[PDB]
Amino acid sequence: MHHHHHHSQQLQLRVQGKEKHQTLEVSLSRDSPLKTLMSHYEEAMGLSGRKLSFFFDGTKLSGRELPADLGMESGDLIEVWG
């Protein structure tokens, strides 16, 4: 989450799905919209085309948000349902 090698302007985020093995720590630029993380997760997990829904703070992500739009911070978690 906070290892010393990380660039100080990226956010480390945990993306966690329904199974223990459906998980990924994603490094996201502050100026990348969340859709980049959501696609990244789908691509890494092999779950493209499954209509997964990503939640932060109890609300569904559209993918259009920057992390700052939501008060999302390095070390936060995004829950993937489906």
The CATH number assigned to the domain holding 70 equals 3.10.20.90
Among candidates 60, 23, 29, which has minimal Cα distance to 44? 23
Q: Is 30 within 8 Å of 6 (Cβ atoms)?
A: no
| Dihedral sign computed on CA atoms, order 46, 57, 28, 14 | negative
Q: How was it solved? A: X-ray
Domain count, the chain: 1
Q: 34 and 54 in contact (C-beta within 8 Å)?
A: yes
* Domain encompassing residue 44: 1-82
CA angle 68, 45, 3 (to 5 degrees): 50
